[PDB]
Design a protein around this ligand. Structure first.
Ligand SMILES: [K+]
Ligand SMILES: [K+]
Ligand SMILES: [K+]
Ligand SMILES: [K+]
Lengths: 292, 292, 292, 292
């Protein structure tokens, strides 16, 4: 559902840069078998940036189709134009998705009032649950706790993917919102800390390749067994860091390929193939994780 | 030119959020009368973010028609997917624009090699002169001097709009590029300094409302009359700062309207109307510039 | 001892800027009565910066004398010259203090290896327990977890006052050190979070004026009653922030004065009297805390 | 002068960590022969941090004697307590030094008003010309242009050593001060740029080992021959960078020794001997400068 280990799933491509269905199916089967709570489809790790909205929609539909009710699917729906965000959302009305992950507008750097108006308008024109998404390092702006608090009063704004890696934000946000509001980490390396502070889960890059460990860890964290969760986390930590040694999803797509989870590690420009140096850092991380 | 004062022109809109031709014509006549060297159409200040590519192309073509051979027009062509950058650039091939202003991919944060491959592919699918554009605060990435040097070796990559505010870049880039590679400021408050270090002009937001002073100031600069240029700069400096008191282009659109240069200060969400406190700030800066 | 609520105690001065004994006595009595675990004497809040080592020693001796065994006293001993650090430490051999709080060298910005050698040398030439102190915002350098880990193997380096407000440091450090090693917050605003993540206490500015609440909160945190601790913390939070509205200890010394805890709020230059604006922000914080 | 190339001279030490007179004399003769404009004695590069005030005064007086009227000598007088700044400055009153270099209080992070009161009190207890010194990365505080403007109104406050690396400050300060207030770079890698914007010279670490080129370069700059100056700057640029490959003055001391300019590269803890990897880096930069 909207807690636990949620995978920010790669969009597996062939050598032409087109979605590879066979590979997506394997990945979905892998997640159903590994205890992953939900799949975020065509988020950042999903290369939302370089799929056009038609392809973005296909991949979501294909993901849902392959999932076949076995695992909930959340659609990435973010756009830096509110009209575009709205209109992309409509595309997934009645699709079967359980909700949407919607990023703060990138590049144009709106005010807090602007972010409020953006997200309120989007929530207005759908019945689907909305997860807010904050990642200033990508977007150039920062959705502050106060504004999260105003937006949480809207019926179908139900949570936030907090990707700052600033852990003070957990309780600043939490004080300000009801206990039903979901607090999910968007930063693998600090996600166990995030959960220990009161977070409910993680929308994860690491889960693409360490699905089971991430699921166990997140469940331990929810039960208060932090010591036990850390042991897993310790072992995943090089992966938490080195999946970003080169721009996400370059490392993780290579990792999937190396595990045999996807046929090719192809991406679309401006993402470029992994360097040999990166190959060697990632492979070492995988082995530390015990995955290789 | 690709020297002197270049306006990053606002896209004036009617109350419905669509381009207002009467207001655009006024603006262009003004820049023609004021001695502005060129117009950048649908760059950041032109709200590229909230126009779709058709609307963007319409505004560019409308601007070109209205300019009527009197002043060169540079098309904003930025896009964070390389395929989309190519496709948008292709819309203007054999159109009469004199060049493209193309920004580093935002949000997806490519490597330097990715930046290289992005812009190289773009350059290769056009005869148009290309001006690179670096604005890390909006994009999440930083096109370093070295990559600039690499890209300057491509025939139709002929300049950079440097919006970091970091003046050390002028001479870092200069030493690595040829004598005729153009260096333009993207930061009004430091543009004169930029020019004094060896930059060749500015793509300016301030020029929207103080086109005459800006053209004056850059002429002085090119002729090496910096003390003189500097008297104008201090006249404009509060505008250089306070045009960003709220997110650009919210302040400059209000200022245009106030100066009677455009009919309405309407913008597209997620940009929001200027606050009362913001009006008063901007109006003060305009008084200081001698424009009210 | 070296856990719980530990006060970074002000050095109360008269109008000549000289230690006011009557005021220090009141403060010490207040801490013994309020359940404060220990007193840090002549730390940062204690104006170590502007007391010469002779005065620094007096204040420590006078604090110990007034405490009269009722409350443990830790001496600030930090110096950016290792010889000086050593020699200042010798001054407190057999004094009665239970330990020393020693800051990373300020201004000169040594390497990690330098910090290792600094702290190892100091620990060598005393039997007293040493608490490391990291606060990059003041010092210009950052003692990283890895180096904390090497230093924790030295017998009498027993803990760290981590003042970064970066909460990822708690478990990075903790993984690397034995379970006996003490992890204390040096940042009031994030101290409950710090403790929730595995910290043992706080060396606190807020404790100067909210001794009892801070003691209760820290004890709740140690017992795992985080929800109950947060309620207190919520009420102290404006104080956690506004005691730094102007440079520490300007606000807190004024606060003490306003409570009647000290006779004058005098400081030594380059610390300057509180502004009226600051007066009003602090008084509001105190009232929110219920202290006024 | 207080213009041209000014060396921030190393305090050469014997193997015991005490000033080595033979080596200091060599250094001074070299600067006299090389055309260095003035010597700053016991500034940051001179290890002010690890010398007590007597030792500091001894080195200053020794430097003055050895200079023997051949080259002006500026005493480092910084101190984070105002009383100590006054007392150290008083040691040099009627000594033959031509001015003091006095840094913003480090560690205690005063307000702008505190900075004002600090330096004003200092100026008032001496007839010596005072050069302000801003280096936020070491001190934790930033003396803004406006406060500089305020302080320039004091008679014996006559200049600033600006070590931010932020070139915008040259013209911000300049507009607020009188025509004869001196602006010196504190950042070798940007000093030529600093000068091209209107700065009057540099207090340099590079000049320790490339005194001749540095003096050449600043002459060219003052005469407005920037292209020419710039050929020298690129010859020195790897040294400008790699002299900080490890904490200053670890690299420049090793380089002096290597050039036979001093007997030993010994420093005081917490500064540590240069790493093997550091030697090789620095030696490379020296080869590039044409000095090996
Ligand atoms: K809600
Ligand atoms: K070119
Ligand atoms: K130990
Ligand atoms: K003066």
């Amino acid at each position: 559902m909207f807690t636990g280990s949620i995978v920010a799933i790669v969009t597996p491509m062939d050598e032409k840069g087109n979605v590879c269905r066979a590979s997506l199916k394997k990945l979905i089967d892998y997640h159903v078998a590994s205890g992953t709570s939900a799949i975020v489809s065509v988020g950042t790790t999903g290369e939302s940036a370089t799929l056009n909205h038609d392809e973005h929609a296909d991949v979501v539909m294909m993901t849902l189709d392959l999932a076949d009710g076995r695992i909930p699917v959340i659609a990435g729906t973010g756009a830096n134009a509110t009209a575009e965000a709205i209109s992309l959302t409509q595309r997934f009305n009645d699709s079967g998705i359980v909700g949407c992950l919607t990023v703060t507008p990138y590049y144009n750097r709106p005010s807090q009032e602007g972010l409020y108006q953006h997200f309120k308008a989007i929530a207005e024109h759908t019945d689907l649950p909305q997860i807010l998404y904050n990642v200033p390092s990508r977007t150039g702006c920062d959705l502050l706790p106060e504004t999260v608090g105003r937006l949480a009063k809207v019926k179908n704004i139900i949570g936030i993917k907090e990707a700052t890696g600033n852990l003070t934000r957990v309780n600043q946000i939490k004080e300000l919102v009801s206990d039903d509001f979901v607090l999910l980490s968007g930063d693998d390396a600090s996600a166990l800390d995030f959960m220990q502070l009161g977070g409910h889960g993680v929308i994860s890059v690491t889960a693409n390749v360490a699905a089971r460990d991430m699921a166990q860890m997140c469940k331990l964290a929810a039960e208060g067994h932090f010591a036990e969760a850390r042991v897993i986390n310790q072992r995943l930590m090089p992966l938490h860091n080195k999946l970003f040694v080169e721009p996400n999803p370059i490392p993780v797509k290579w990792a999937c390929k190396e595990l045999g989870l996807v046929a090719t590690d192809t991406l679309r420009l401006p993402m470029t193939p992994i360097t040999d140096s990166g190959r060697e850092t990632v492979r070492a991380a995988l082995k530390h994780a015990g995955l290789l």
